[PDB]
Amino acid sequence: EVVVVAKFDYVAQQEQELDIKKNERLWLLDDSKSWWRVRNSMNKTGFVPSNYVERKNS
Amino acid sequence: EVVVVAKFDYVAQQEQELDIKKNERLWLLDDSKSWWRVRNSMNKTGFVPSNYVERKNS
Ligand code: NA
Ligand code: NA
């Protein structure tokens, strides 16, 4: 239901990303959640909700 | 270089997401950028930087 508008162009850097143009309108998915891209100890990469992770102090 | 720690478990909902467990340590990729998942007018889905889009008021 939530529509967003591109403020700037973005050229996708990876196949999971999307190319967008300034002023393009898009559906915002996943209840408007913010994501971080992470890599685990087995070298698998993917997106997780940014609220579920925090920087480590060590 | 930046390591994050899972605060909670997360079960991935899509193949682009990652399953993580509480207390797991992960590499944070993409200069710690936040992402939104969007769908365009051609029904292609992907992640874009959340700073590059904003909610539309119409
Ligand atoms: Na966080
Ligand atoms: Na934004």
Numbering used by the authors:
A (entry chain A), B (entry chain A): 5 to 62
Please share excerpts from the published article on this structure.
Nck proteins are composed of three N-terminal SH3 domains and a single C-terminal SH2 domain (reviewed in Ref. 3). Nck recruitment is required for complete T cell activation, and its inhibition dampens TCR signaling by reducing Zap70 phosphorylation. The objective of the present study was to initiate development of an inhibitor of the Nck/TCR interaction, specifically by blocking binding of the first SH3 domain in Nck (Nck1-SH3.1) to the PRS in the CD3ϵ subunit of the TCR. During our studies, it became clear that Nck-SH3.1 exhibits conformational diversity and can swap half the number of its residues to form a dimer.
During the crystallization efforts that led to the monomeric apo- and peptide-bound Nck1-SH3.1 crystal structures, seven more structures were determined that all exhibited domain swaps, leading to dimers. The swaps are located at the exact same position in all structures (i.e. Lys-36 in the n-Src loop), clearly visible based on the high-resolution electron density. Dimers are formed by exchange of the C-terminal 25 residues, almost half of the entire SH3 domain. The interface thus generated contains a short anti-parallel β-sheet encompassing the CD3ϵ sequence 36KSWW39. Superposition of the Nck1-SH3.1 structure with the bound CD3ϵ peptide shows that domain swap and tight peptide binding are mutually exclusive. The C-terminal half of the SH3.1-binding sequence would get into steric conflict with the second SH3.1 domain in the dimer. All of the dimers are swapped in the same manner, but with different juxtapositions of the second SH3.1 domain with respect to the first. The hinge at Lys-36 provides quite a bit of flexibility that allows the dimer to pack in many different crystal lattices. Indeed, the hinge region varies over ∼6 Å within the superposed ensemble, and the distal loop covers a distance of ∼8 Å in the dimers. Given the large number of swapped, independent chains present in different crystal forms and grown under different conditions, swapping seems an intrinsic property of this SH3 domain.
